Amino acid sequence: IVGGYTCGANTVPYQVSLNSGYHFCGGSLINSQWVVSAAHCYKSGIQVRLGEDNINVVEGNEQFISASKSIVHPSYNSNTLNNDIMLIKLKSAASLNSRVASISLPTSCASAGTQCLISGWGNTKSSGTSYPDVLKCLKAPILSDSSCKSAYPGQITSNMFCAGYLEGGKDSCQGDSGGPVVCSGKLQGIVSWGSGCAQKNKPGVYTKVCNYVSWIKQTIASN
Ligand SMILES: [Ca+2]
Structure with a gap:
Protein backbone atom coordinates (compact mmCIF):
# COMPACT_ATOMS: atom_id res chain seq x y z
CA ILE A 1 0.00 0.00 0.00
CA ILE A 103 -16.23 -10.38 5.91
CA SER A 104 -19.68 -10.35 4.32
CA LEU A 105 -20.14 -10.85 0.58
CA PRO A 106 -22.03 -8.13 -1.24
CA THR A 107 -25.70 -8.46 -2.01
CA SER A 108 -25.40 -5.54 -4.46
CA CYS A 109 -22.56 -4.09 -6.46
CA ALA A 110 -21.03 -0.85 -5.26
CA SER A 111 -21.18 2.41 -7.15
CA ALA A 112 -18.53 4.85 -8.23
CA GLY A 113 -17.83 7.32 -5.40
CA THR A 114 -18.30 4.78 -2.65
CA GLN A 115 -15.56 4.87 -0.12
CA CYS A 116 -13.65 1.67 0.59
CA LEU A 117 -10.84 0.28 2.69
CA ILE A 118 -7.97 -1.44 0.92
CA SER A 119 -5.33 -3.22 2.97
CA GLY A 120 -2.20 -5.33 2.74
CA TRP A 121 1.49 -5.97 3.36
CA GLY A 122 2.65 -4.93 -0.08
CA ASN A 123 5.24 -2.41 -1.20
CA THR A 124 4.84 1.07 0.26
CA LYS A 125 6.90 2.89 -2.40
CA SER A 126 5.90 3.99 -5.92
CA SER A 127 9.56 4.05 -7.04
CA GLY A 128 11.79 1.39 -5.53
CA THR A 129 10.85 -1.01 -2.79
CA SER A 130 10.04 -1.19 0.89
CA TYR A 131 7.90 -3.96 2.42
CA PRO A 132 6.22 -3.34 5.69
CA ASP A 133 5.93 -5.72 8.47
CA VAL A 134 2.64 -4.42 9.85
CA LEU A 135 -0.64 -4.19 7.94
CA LYS A 136 -1.21 -1.00 5.92
CA CYS A 137 -4.54 0.58 5.05
CA LEU A 138 -5.85 3.01 2.45
CA LYS A 139 -9.24 4.66 2.18
CA ALA A 140 -10.08 5.16 -1.50
CA PRO A 141 -13.14 5.68 -3.67
CA ILE A 142 -14.41 3.53 -6.47
CA LEU A 143 -13.92 5.36 -9.79
CA SER A 144 -16.35 5.60 -12.63
CA ASP A 145 -16.26 2.91 -15.29
CA SER A 146 -15.63 5.61 -17.88
CA SER A 147 -12.58 6.99 -16.03
CA CYS A 148 -11.31 3.44 -15.49
CA LYS A 149 -11.58 2.61 -19.18
CA SER A 150 -10.02 5.89 -20.19
CA ALA A 151 -7.05 5.13 -17.91
CA TYR A 152 -6.60 1.61 -19.34
CA PRO A 153 -7.89 1.53 -22.90
CA GLY A 154 -8.81 -1.92 -24.14
CA GLN A 155 -8.17 -3.57 -20.76
CA ILE A 156 -11.14 -3.12 -18.38
CA THR A 157 -13.77 -5.83 -18.46
CA SER A 158 -17.14 -5.99 -16.77
CA ASN A 159 -15.41 -8.02 -14.04
CA MET A 160 -13.11 -5.16 -13.02
CA PHE A 161 -13.33 -1.78 -11.44
CA CYS A 162 -10.89 0.99 -10.66
CA ALA A 163 -10.43 2.55 -7.27
CA GLY A 164 -8.03 5.15 -5.93
CA TYR A 165 -6.80 8.55 -7.00
CA LEU A 166 -6.02 9.72 -10.54
CA GLU A 167 -3.54 12.30 -9.16
CA GLY A 168 -1.25 9.50 -8.05
CA GLY A 169 0.44 8.86 -4.66
CA LYS A 170 -2.12 6.49 -3.07
CA ASP A 171 -2.71 2.92 -4.27
CA SER A 172 -2.26 -0.74 -3.62
CA CYS A 173 0.89 -2.38 -4.94
CA GLN A 174 2.91 -5.58 -5.36
CA GLY A 175 2.34 -7.87 -2.39
CA ASP A 176 -1.17 -6.49 -1.76
CA SER A 177 -2.45 -8.76 -4.57
CA GLY A 178 -5.38 -10.88 -3.56
CA GLY A 179 -6.34 -8.70 -0.62
CA PRO A 180 -9.58 -6.93 0.21
CA VAL A 181 -11.44 -3.87 -0.91
CA VAL A 182 -14.24 -3.47 1.65
CA CYS A 183 -17.00 -0.89 1.26
CA SER A 184 -19.71 -0.41 3.86
CA GLY A 185 -18.79 -3.73 5.48
CA LYS A 186 -18.93 -5.79 2.26
CA LEU A 187 -16.12 -7.33 0.21
CA GLN A 188 -16.52 -5.57 -3.13
CA GLY A 189 -13.01 -5.97 -4.57
CA ILE A 190 -9.86 -8.00 -4.74
CA VAL A 191 -6.45 -6.36 -5.39
CA SER A 192 -5.77 -7.42 -8.99
CA TRP A 193 -3.50 -5.21 -11.14
CA GLY A 194 -2.33 -1.76 -12.20
CA SER A 195 0.46 -0.06 -14.10
CA GLY A 196 3.22 0.37 -11.52
CA CYS A 197 1.81 1.67 -8.23
CA ALA A 198 0.41 5.09 -7.32
CA GLN A 199 1.19 6.51 -10.76
CA LYS A 200 -0.71 9.46 -12.16
CA ASN A 201 -3.70 8.41 -14.25
CA LYS A 202 -3.10 4.75 -13.47
CA PRO A 203 -5.41 3.77 -10.63
CA GLY A 204 -5.67 0.35 -9.11
CA VAL A 205 -7.74 -2.29 -10.83
CA TYR A 206 -9.81 -4.69 -8.72
CA THR A 207 -11.81 -7.84 -9.31
CA LYS A 208 -15.55 -6.99 -9.10
CA VAL A 209 -16.59 -9.45 -6.37
CA CYS A 210 -20.36 -8.83 -6.70
CA1 LIG B 1 2.58 -12.08 13.46
Whole structure:
Protein backbone atom coordinates (compact mmCIF):
# COMPACT_ATOMS: atom_id res chain seq x y z
CA ILE A 1 0.00 0.00 0.00
CA VAL A 2 1.49 3.30 -1.12
CA GLY A 3 0.38 6.49 0.63
CA GLY A 4 -1.69 4.71 3.26
CA TYR A 5 -1.58 4.43 7.02
CA THR A 6 -0.78 1.79 9.65
CA CYS A 7 -4.15 0.03 10.22
CA GLY A 8 -3.54 -0.98 13.80
CA ALA A 9 -3.18 -4.57 14.97
CA ASN A 10 -6.17 -6.75 14.20
CA THR A 11 -8.36 -3.85 13.09
CA VAL A 12 -8.96 -5.59 9.76
CA PRO A 13 -9.96 -8.97 11.08
CA TYR A 14 -10.81 -10.60 7.76
CA GLN A 15 -7.38 -9.81 6.26
CA VAL A 16 -5.22 -12.87 5.71
CA SER A 17 -1.64 -13.36 4.55
CA LEU A 18 -0.95 -16.23 2.16
CA ASN A 19 2.39 -17.77 3.06
CA SER A 20 4.57 -20.24 1.16
CA GLY A 21 7.65 -19.80 3.33
CA TYR A 22 7.10 -16.01 3.10
CA HIS A 23 4.15 -13.68 2.59
CA PHE A 24 3.22 -13.51 -1.09
CA CYS A 25 -0.41 -12.34 -1.32
CA GLY A 26 -3.35 -11.14 0.67
CA GLY A 27 -6.79 -12.69 0.95
CA SER A 28 -10.10 -12.25 2.75
CA LEU A 29 -11.76 -14.66 5.17
CA ILE A 30 -15.37 -15.16 4.11
CA ASN A 31 -16.37 -17.95 6.51
CA SER A 32 -14.62 -20.18 9.00
CA GLN A 33 -13.31 -22.46 6.23
CA TRP A 34 -12.82 -20.30 3.16
CA VAL A 35 -10.69 -17.48 1.85
CA VAL A 36 -11.16 -15.32 -1.26
CA SER A 37 -8.05 -14.19 -3.12
CA ALA A 38 -6.83 -13.38 -6.63
CA ALA A 39 -6.32 -16.21 -9.16
CA HIS A 40 -2.97 -14.69 -10.01
CA CYS A 41 -1.98 -15.59 -6.43
CA TYR A 42 -2.45 -19.32 -7.15
CA LYS A 43 0.27 -21.69 -6.04
CA SER A 44 0.47 -25.03 -4.28
CA GLY A 45 1.46 -25.37 -0.64
CA ILE A 46 -0.31 -22.33 0.76
CA GLN A 47 -0.51 -21.71 4.50
CA VAL A 48 -3.18 -19.17 5.41
CA ARG A 49 -2.15 -16.85 8.24
CA LEU A 50 -5.08 -15.22 10.07
CA GLY A 51 -4.89 -12.78 12.97
CA GLU A 52 -1.70 -11.18 11.65
CA ASP A 53 -0.36 -7.72 12.22
CA ASN A 54 3.48 -7.92 12.10
CA ILE A 55 4.02 -10.82 9.66
CA ASN A 56 7.58 -11.35 10.95
CA VAL A 57 6.80 -11.57 14.68
CA VAL A 58 4.48 -13.92 16.58
CA GLU A 59 2.37 -11.48 18.54
CA GLY A 60 -0.32 -13.73 20.02
CA ASN A 61 -3.38 -13.62 17.82
CA GLU A 62 -2.26 -15.69 14.85
CA GLN A 63 -3.90 -18.80 13.44
CA PHE A 64 -1.78 -20.61 10.86
CA ILE A 65 -3.86 -23.12 8.84
CA SER A 66 -2.77 -24.97 5.73
CA ALA A 67 -4.98 -24.93 2.63
CA SER A 68 -6.60 -28.23 1.68
CA LYS A 69 -7.72 -27.13 -1.75
CA SER A 70 -7.48 -24.05 -4.10
CA ILE A 71 -10.13 -23.33 -6.81
CA VAL A 72 -9.21 -20.80 -9.46
CA HIS A 73 -12.18 -19.34 -11.27
CA PRO A 74 -13.18 -21.51 -14.22
CA SER A 75 -12.75 -18.61 -16.67
CA TYR A 76 -9.61 -16.96 -15.26
CA ASN A 77 -7.40 -15.62 -18.03
CA SER A 78 -3.88 -14.90 -16.82
CA ASN A 79 -3.07 -12.73 -19.84
CA THR A 80 -5.93 -10.26 -19.40
CA LEU A 81 -6.58 -10.94 -15.69
CA ASN A 82 -10.26 -11.32 -16.46
CA ASN A 83 -11.95 -13.28 -13.65
CA ASP A 84 -9.01 -12.80 -11.24
CA ILE A 85 -10.53 -14.66 -8.30
CA MET A 86 -9.73 -17.87 -6.42
CA LEU A 87 -11.14 -19.67 -3.41
CA ILE A 88 -8.95 -21.40 -0.84
CA LYS A 89 -10.29 -23.93 1.67
CA LEU A 90 -8.68 -24.29 5.08
CA LYS A 91 -7.83 -27.78 6.41
CA SER A 92 -9.51 -26.85 9.70
CA ALA A 93 -12.01 -24.15 10.62
CA ALA A 94 -10.66 -20.89 11.91
CA SER A 95 -11.66 -19.85 15.40
CA LEU A 96 -13.76 -16.69 15.02
CA ASN A 97 -13.66 -13.84 17.77
CA SER A 98 -13.26 -9.96 17.19
CA ARG A 99 -9.68 -10.14 15.95
CA VAL A 100 -10.33 -12.98 13.41
CA ALA A 101 -13.63 -12.59 11.59
CA SER A 102 -15.20 -13.19 8.26
CA ILE A 103 -16.23 -10.38 5.91
CA SER A 104 -19.68 -10.35 4.32
CA LEU A 105 -20.14 -10.85 0.58
CA PRO A 106 -22.03 -8.13 -1.24
CA THR A 107 -25.70 -8.46 -2.01
CA SER A 108 -25.40 -5.54 -4.46
CA CYS A 109 -22.56 -4.09 -6.46
CA ALA A 110 -21.03 -0.85 -5.26
CA SER A 111 -21.18 2.41 -7.15
CA ALA A 112 -18.53 4.85 -8.23
CA GLY A 113 -17.83 7.32 -5.40
CA THR A 114 -18.30 4.78 -2.65
CA GLN A 115 -15.56 4.87 -0.12
CA CYS A 116 -13.65 1.67 0.59
CA LEU A 117 -10.84 0.28 2.69
CA ILE A 118 -7.97 -1.44 0.92
CA SER A 119 -5.33 -3.22 2.97
CA GLY A 120 -2.20 -5.33 2.74
CA TRP A 121 1.49 -5.97 3.36
CA GLY A 122 2.65 -4.93 -0.08
CA ASN A 123 5.24 -2.41 -1.20
CA THR A 124 4.84 1.07 0.26
CA LYS A 125 6.90 2.89 -2.40
CA SER A 126 5.90 3.99 -5.92
CA SER A 127 9.56 4.05 -7.04
CA GLY A 128 11.79 1.39 -5.53
CA THR A 129 10.85 -1.01 -2.79
CA SER A 130 10.04 -1.19 0.89
CA TYR A 131 7.90 -3.96 2.42
CA PRO A 132 6.22 -3.34 5.69
CA ASP A 133 5.93 -5.72 8.47
CA VAL A 134 2.64 -4.42 9.85
CA LEU A 135 -0.64 -4.19 7.94
CA LYS A 136 -1.21 -1.00 5.92
CA CYS A 137 -4.54 0.58 5.05
CA LEU A 138 -5.85 3.01 2.45
CA LYS A 139 -9.24 4.66 2.18
CA ALA A 140 -10.08 5.16 -1.50
CA PRO A 141 -13.14 5.68 -3.67
CA ILE A 142 -14.41 3.53 -6.47
CA LEU A 143 -13.92 5.36 -9.79
CA SER A 144 -16.35 5.60 -12.63
CA ASP A 145 -16.26 2.91 -15.29
CA SER A 146 -15.63 5.61 -17.88
CA SER A 147 -12.58 6.99 -16.03
CA CYS A 148 -11.31 3.44 -15.49
CA LYS A 149 -11.58 2.61 -19.18
CA SER A 150 -10.02 5.89 -20.19
CA ALA A 151 -7.05 5.13 -17.91
CA TYR A 152 -6.60 1.61 -19.34
CA PRO A 153 -7.89 1.53 -22.90
CA GLY A 154 -8.81 -1.92 -24.14
CA GLN A 155 -8.17 -3.57 -20.76
CA ILE A 156 -11.14 -3.12 -18.38
CA THR A 157 -13.77 -5.83 -18.46
CA SER A 158 -17.14 -5.99 -16.77
CA ASN A 159 -15.41 -8.02 -14.04
CA MET A 160 -13.11 -5.16 -13.02
CA PHE A 161 -13.33 -1.78 -11.44
CA CYS A 162 -10.89 0.99 -10.66
CA ALA A 163 -10.43 2.55 -7.27
CA GLY A 164 -8.03 5.15 -5.93
CA TYR A 165 -6.80 8.55 -7.00
CA LEU A 166 -6.02 9.72 -10.54
CA GLU A 167 -3.54 12.30 -9.16
CA GLY A 168 -1.25 9.50 -8.05
CA GLY A 169 0.44 8.86 -4.66
CA LYS A 170 -2.12 6.49 -3.07
CA ASP A 171 -2.71 2.92 -4.27
CA SER A 172 -2.26 -0.74 -3.62
CA CYS A 173 0.89 -2.38 -4.94
CA GLN A 174 2.91 -5.58 -5.36
CA GLY A 175 2.34 -7.87 -2.39
CA ASP A 176 -1.17 -6.49 -1.76
CA SER A 177 -2.45 -8.76 -4.57
CA GLY A 178 -5.38 -10.88 -3.56
CA GLY A 179 -6.34 -8.70 -0.62
CA PRO A 180 -9.58 -6.93 0.21
CA VAL A 181 -11.44 -3.87 -0.91
CA VAL A 182 -14.24 -3.47 1.65
CA CYS A 183 -17.00 -0.89 1.26
CA SER A 184 -19.71 -0.41 3.86
CA GLY A 185 -18.79 -3.73 5.48
CA LYS A 186 -18.93 -5.79 2.26
CA LEU A 187 -16.12 -7.33 0.21
CA GLN A 188 -16.52 -5.57 -3.13
CA GLY A 189 -13.01 -5.97 -4.57
CA ILE A 190 -9.86 -8.00 -4.74
CA VAL A 191 -6.45 -6.36 -5.39
CA SER A 192 -5.77 -7.42 -8.99
CA TRP A 193 -3.50 -5.21 -11.14
CA GLY A 194 -2.33 -1.76 -12.20
CA SER A 195 0.46 -0.06 -14.10
CA GLY A 196 3.22 0.37 -11.52
CA CYS A 197 1.81 1.67 -8.23
CA ALA A 198 0.41 5.09 -7.32
CA GLN A 199 1.19 6.51 -10.76
CA LYS A 200 -0.71 9.46 -12.16
CA ASN A 201 -3.70 8.41 -14.25
CA LYS A 202 -3.10 4.75 -13.47
CA PRO A 203 -5.41 3.77 -10.63
CA GLY A 204 -5.67 0.35 -9.11
CA VAL A 205 -7.74 -2.29 -10.83
CA TYR A 206 -9.81 -4.69 -8.72
CA THR A 207 -11.81 -7.84 -9.31
CA LYS A 208 -15.55 -6.99 -9.10
CA VAL A 209 -16.59 -9.45 -6.37
CA CYS A 210 -20.36 -8.83 -6.70
CA ASN A 211 -20.25 -10.66 -10.07
CA TYR A 212 -18.95 -13.81 -8.37
CA VAL A 213 -21.22 -14.24 -5.35
CA SER A 214 -23.29 -16.97 -7.02
CA TRP A 215 -20.15 -18.90 -7.99
CA ILE A 216 -18.64 -18.45 -4.52
CA LYS A 217 -21.75 -19.68 -2.74
CA GLN A 218 -22.31 -22.68 -5.02
CA THR A 219 -18.62 -23.64 -4.85
CA ILE A 220 -18.58 -23.53 -1.07
CA ALA A 221 -21.81 -25.56 -0.92
CA SER A 222 -20.24 -28.45 -2.83
CA ASN A 223 -16.62 -28.42 -1.64
CA1 LIG B 1 2.58 -12.08 13.46
